[PDB]
């Protein structure tokens, strides 16, 4: 019909662009009945891929399914959509990594959702709101590391809106109960009566009721047989409702009307990032002692120069912590880059990120939260290490990712007989060392499997010839304690001087991506 063809058009227009997903997730949400039709079409398209072999269109579909199946207001008992989905995704076990590793984790989610309805939405909401129980307690907190100046005022307004405390524990627990009950009893329940009776109850009894509901759901998810798990959950919830004193609200022979329950806004905190180091986080961690595995969603709103020093701060918070666990003590960090280099690279790999993140309550709020919520696979950046031995015997290990000069130009930004030894290498793991010294003025390390830096050489030897080459590893030694500066990814503040020896060699808190 018209609605079906509209949905199909949106689907075919999101799988070709940044707000073509949000528009799907805004057309479906109107009628509780639109969530099944969309799923059918997705399954159809998925089967087509299985027949064809289009390796490039699998990872986006597996993300739309996960995304829709987790908001579906209710599944009628007659519907066998989940079984068809499991049969469709069972045949990807014969595909190559990582597709088989996205399909196993989708099949697990499709069994958790087959047995215990609403479990995957109560887990998410629970965590994000920090309203868990005393048996399986968790939490997630979102920190919006945004630079007041470099970033636009629109993103400041979005961050301010996301920082306003939206829900209360009372309202959050009411929404969770409403969605747990609807997911199970479909139309056969009265959500208006349930809401009216739940409003007057006290916080403690609501918490106890939710703790029993969540424990029953978790136990039901453990049942071996699928068929009996739903009936057992229905009986347990019926007894819970009888105990809570609204038995005339469920099992109503008269049928009601389905209602769409959206995901409540998560907890967010906005902090002024004028620096580049990730020390800010440990300062924050003081009010976490009073605001308390768990997880922290650090949204590093990002510019170009920032990117460089952001990777440098990432550097510390990577190794520093790995060696001095302070934040990792409690939380598993996850950093999110908002384009407002890292961009380019993370796009060339995973299109969904480029198409969505790169193309960027207000629409920007929805799309932001949606990205942060569903993107769960990392991409490791390619960094290079440097050892800077100084005249007095000081050795400093730096970690650059963009560029690194050394020479007259390094002082200019702030000619020598610089020994140069370099070692190129082939794809077959065979190296070809070379020890050729050239007297020159400026040497710029330029970021050209792995990646091979490039060695710049400015041989202007004048009385009164600048060459660039590839390099897999480099060693630039000075001429008998002769001073020379050392740039760092086009640094304009931190440029050391009087260095003697600099060797550059190819080198949880991930940089999360969708795929």
């Amino acid at each position: 019909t018209c609605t079906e063809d509209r949905i199909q058009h949106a689907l075919e227009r999101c799988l070709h662009l940044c707000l073509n997903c949000w528009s799907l997730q805004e057309l479906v949400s109107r009628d509780p009945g639109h969530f099944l039709i969309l799923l059918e079409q997705i399954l159809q398209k998925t089967r087509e891929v299985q027949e064809k072999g289009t390796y490039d269109l699998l990872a986006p579909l597996a993300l739309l399914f996960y995304s829709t199946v987790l908001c579906t207001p209710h599944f009628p008992p007659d519907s066998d959509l989940l079984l068809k989905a499991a049969r469709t995704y069972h045949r990807f076990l014969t595909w190559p990594v990582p597709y088989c590793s996205i399909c196993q984790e989708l099949l697990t989610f499709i069994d958790a959702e087959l047995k215990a309805p609403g479990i995957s939405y109560q887990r998410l909401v629970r965590a994000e709101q920090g309203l868990s129980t005393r048996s399986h307690r968790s939490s997630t907190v979102t920190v919006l590391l945004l630079n007041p100046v470099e970033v636009q005022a629109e993103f400041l307004d979005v961050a301010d809106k996301l920082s306003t405390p939206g829900p209360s524990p009372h309202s959050a627990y009411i929404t969770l109960l409403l969605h747990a009950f609807q997911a199970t009893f479909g139309a056969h329940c009265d959500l208006s009566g349930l809401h009216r009776r739940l409003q007057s109850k006290t916080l403690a009894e609501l918490e106890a009721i939710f703790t029993e509901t969540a424990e029953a759901q978790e136990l039901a998810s453990g049942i071996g047989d699928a068929a009996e798990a739903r009936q057992w959950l229905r009986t347990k919830l019926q007894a819970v409702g009888e105990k809570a004193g609204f038995p005339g609200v469920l099992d109503t022979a008269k049928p009601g009307k389905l209602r769409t329950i959206p995901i409540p806004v998560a907890r967010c905190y906005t902090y002024s990032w004028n620096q580049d180091s990730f020390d800010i986080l440990q300062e924050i961690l003081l009010k976490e002692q009073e605001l308390l595995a768990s997880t922290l969603r650090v949204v590093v709103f990002g510019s170009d120069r920032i990117s460089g020093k952001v990777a440098r701060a990432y550097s510390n918070l990577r190794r520093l912590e790995n060696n001095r666990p302070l934040l990792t003590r409690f939380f598993k960090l996850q950093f999110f880059y908002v384009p407002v280099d890292i961009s380019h690279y993370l796009g060339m790999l995973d299109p969904w990120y480029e198409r969505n993140v790169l193309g960027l309550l207000p629409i920007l709020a929805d799309m932001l939260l949606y990205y942060c919520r569903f993107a769960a696979r990392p991409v490791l950046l390619q960094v290079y290490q440097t050892e800077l031995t100084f005249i007095t015997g000081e050795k400093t290990t730096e970690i650059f990712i963009h560029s690194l000069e050394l020479g007259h130009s390094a002082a200019t930004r702030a000619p020598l007989t610089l020994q140069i030894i370099y070692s190129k290498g082939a794809i077959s793991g065979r190296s070809r060392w070379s020890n050729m010294e050239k007297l020159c003025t400026s040497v710029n390390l330029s970021k050209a499997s792995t990646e091979a830096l490039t060695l710049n050489l400015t041989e202007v030897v004048k009385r009164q010839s600048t060459s660039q080459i590839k390099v897999d590893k480099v060693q630039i030694i000075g001429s008998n304690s002769c001073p020379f500066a050392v740039c760092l990814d086009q640094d304009e503040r931190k440029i050391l001087q009087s260095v003697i020896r600099c060797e550059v060699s190819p080198c949880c808190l991930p940089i999360m991506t969708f795929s």
């Binding site: 045949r91 076990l93 190559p96 990594v97 082939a426 794809i427 499997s449």
Partner: protein, 1008 residues
Amino acid sequence: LIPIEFVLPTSTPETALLHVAGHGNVEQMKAQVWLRALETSVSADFYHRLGPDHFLLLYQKKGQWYEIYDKYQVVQTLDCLRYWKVLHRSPGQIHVVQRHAPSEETLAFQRQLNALIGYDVTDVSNVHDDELEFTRRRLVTPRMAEVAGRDPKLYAMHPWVTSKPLPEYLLKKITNNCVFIVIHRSTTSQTIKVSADDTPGTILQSFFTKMAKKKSLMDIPESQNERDFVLRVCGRDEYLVGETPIKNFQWVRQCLKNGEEIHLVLDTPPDPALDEVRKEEWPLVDDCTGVTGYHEQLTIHGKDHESVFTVSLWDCDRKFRVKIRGIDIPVLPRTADLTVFVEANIQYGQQVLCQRRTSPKPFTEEVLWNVWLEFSIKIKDLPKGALLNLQIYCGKAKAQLLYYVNLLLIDHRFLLRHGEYVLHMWQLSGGSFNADKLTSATNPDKENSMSISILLDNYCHPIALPKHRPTPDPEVRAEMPNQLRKQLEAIIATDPLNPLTAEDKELLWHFRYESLKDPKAYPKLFSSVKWGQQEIVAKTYQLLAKREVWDQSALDVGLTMQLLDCNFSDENVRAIAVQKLESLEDDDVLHYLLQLVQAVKFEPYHDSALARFLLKRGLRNKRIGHFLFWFLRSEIAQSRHYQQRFAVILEAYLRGCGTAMLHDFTQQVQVIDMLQKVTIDIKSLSSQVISQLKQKLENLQNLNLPQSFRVPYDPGLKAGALVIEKCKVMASKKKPLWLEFKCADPTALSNETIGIIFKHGDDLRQDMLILQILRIMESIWETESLDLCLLPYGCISTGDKIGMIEIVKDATTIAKIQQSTVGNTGAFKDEVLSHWLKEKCPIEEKFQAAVERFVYSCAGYCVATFVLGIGDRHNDNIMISETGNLFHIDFGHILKERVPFVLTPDFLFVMGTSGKKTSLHFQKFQDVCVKAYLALRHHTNLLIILFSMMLMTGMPQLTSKEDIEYIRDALTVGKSEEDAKKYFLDQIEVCRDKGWTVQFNWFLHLVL
């Protein structure tokens, strides 16, 4: 789950009872056992110091200790479980025993074996899997099985018998069915007359009964009887024993042929205790090791993703896909502006299933593509022995092939390959196909060779190729139209090299049950199978499973040697071809031994039915092992493409021969090494050479030069001390050594020396192949009672570019005879050879016998060389004996005016035809030639499948079908006998027309 009780090493012996997942892997079971022992053990420190990789799992199966070697096999398929279920055992016991370092004696024996082989079998530097160690472990079972079941006395004495009927030219020499035998003991000799059907036991018994009165003379201890002695050829080691008529020993026959007395000495039997075998080192490896199971067990359908451990290959419906990352060589081979590209091909045998290639790029020292090549073939249709064939083509600014490498696509464990690979490519130095181009081994030189980096996909679970279930087949039918039957019969009757059109393939595969009734159609019925489709393979196995006619058919070596060629890469065709060779006598496995050794190069996997067949037949006769050793060692030292497989096979053989057979091999590899260092030094640097050699040779007797060794090309002859007054250096470019030993056996009847020519800087494998084919052709001629008096001398290649050659006594080259009178100008008198022969033979009867021998020999050598197509030879490569025999030498090379074979006017003058006149002798020569040619034509398929091999495993340079069609043209395939006779007579007249026209041109070419 399955209950198993593991007996741990720590003491009283502690035991752990566990439940094992049926579909788990051996590594999973090991991990579970280790985890349980970490807790159950009273002292976990002993288990904390070490790990699961320091212990072996051993179980006793009927008094023998087997081991679980494969750390991935499916627990369900372990043969121990089947054994226990048959015996109703539960829980089974698996001992855990810690690994120990090899003792010193083990290392010494391993070093001795490595020295004998000439290659270190224990090296793991050029490998990307464990196929060769796994083959070493698996080959233990056949060796023990054959060693256990060997008769000690018949092994120790190795009689050389045959069952073929006596040729007619030998029944004339046997008068009244009686043979005269001369029996020597000590200083006494007696001539006895025995029946031709008497076994050696009856001969002895009769002797003793005759001489019982006079035993004192013969010096036979009264207390000893006919059971304490054996007969032995005087001078050689050729004991005549066993239950067989005297007329079936190849010695007696040979002596009759040559009109020589049979001289036998009474001797004591060799003690079989000299052939004791060292105790086996390793425990036996479970039999069901390379077994995967059926499709129903492996399939992922009707299961839960949490219960999936393996994925069947036939469940993958995607198109194969390989990533080419790049190529890289340290230094460019040629300097120019060139473009290069990579070509990938799937391949089965010689068939190119699919093909993809990349775009050209400039030929720098490192080229990077990172390109996914997709093949039309689906992953489920891959057959067992496929081979991704990666090739590098160079174009200027056509394309010329530079490097090639092969990678199997299903390992020896029935698993699909995956992950990154860096393979070192060979180089096309020097045609369309060669055996060297099928090897799956990589280039040993890892520092100066080109390398291709590829990447095959990775999967969550191992992907295994199921095993075809032997299920009853539906197919009934009825008679065929008498037109289609005639067409099919016409297709079947063609020669082996006739190509098949698509219509022929479709017809053969449609009526594939009528073709199965005729054995001769098997080599063509299996060439019409589309090996690129799984359904037609499972329909071919259901057809091979009904193999009654093939089993009941008589043995034809020309048909069974056609299923072992490079065209068939399936293990079930080859398997039956070997099942059909397993009934060949020991006298006929020696004729085809070299071909069967060369046919191992076509086997896609190291462990094969043919390798086990050679191993077993080697460990059973003491004369098929002397020659298997020297063929394998000749192939190892030279062929870097297949040295690791031959090394493994030779190691497997050498661990079961005995101590005597290892002493001999050592005492011969020493002589050889010492004489190769002598040769080298001589060359490196007149009277000079003379004295230099004399010195070196006289001082080698102050080193450890063995004083008695078996001649490598005549295992029955023992040579002793050098006669350094008869050695010299032959006058030739490569300066061969003319050694002359003397017999080490004091029973010999004469003082004749043993002449040996030692050659260096030349490859003799082609000579060996040609001489073997000549022996085969002489057996074929013997079948029809023809005696062409060929003289295939003994030649053998010992190592890299070195070799040993027999010396024929009283023989000379025709070139020397011509130069004895003409000089060195290039003229050729026509009566020189006749005068020389007449001078050598003064008596008229001897002269006539010599002339008849000449005639016959020339007829046979002309026919043989014409058929082989190497009859265009220089006059310097043909020798003649003083008895009139004639033979060729130096075949190592021949493999605008042309001749079919050498019939210069001197031969014709010896015969009697001075010009175009005809004489009785030239008529006899024509008749003999015609008869021999027709007899050879009778075995066209055999000679056409032996030539093709001679060419694909022989000359190193590649070859094309145009090179092979010569044999078809020479045998006149498809023509009546009259046409062949006319054709050969025309060839004879062609040689009778040119005279000295090609000889002169060889003389000019050599002088210039």
